[PDB]
Amino acid sequence: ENDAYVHATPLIRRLAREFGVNLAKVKGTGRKGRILREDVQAYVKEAIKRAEAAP
C-alpha cells in the first residue's frame, strides 16, 4: 500500500492485492503514467516467464 497504490484506481488496487503486485514496479501506459489493466497483465506475464526460466 505504497504511493503507487494510492494513485492507482480501485480496480487496479484490487488486482494488485489479488496477485501480489507491487504497483511501483509496473510501468503505466495510461494518461500521465496511470496504470492500466493491460500494464499489470504484461508485468505478470513477464514475471511468470522469468520465474519459470529461473532454477
Contacts to Zn ion by CB under 5 A: 3
Write down the residue that cell numbers 504497483 correspond to.
Answer: 23
Grid coordinates in use for 45?
A: 506475464
Nearest residue to 43 (alpha-carbon basis) of 10, 32, 8: 8
Is residue 50 within the footprint of its own copies (CB under 8 A)?
A: yes
Binders in 6-45 for its own copies, by CB under 8 A: 18-22, 25, 41, 44-45
Neighbouring CB atoms inside 10 A of 21's CB total 21
Nearest-approach distance from CB 49 to Zn ion, in angstroms = 25
Nearest-approach distance from CB 4 to Zn ion, in angstroms = 8
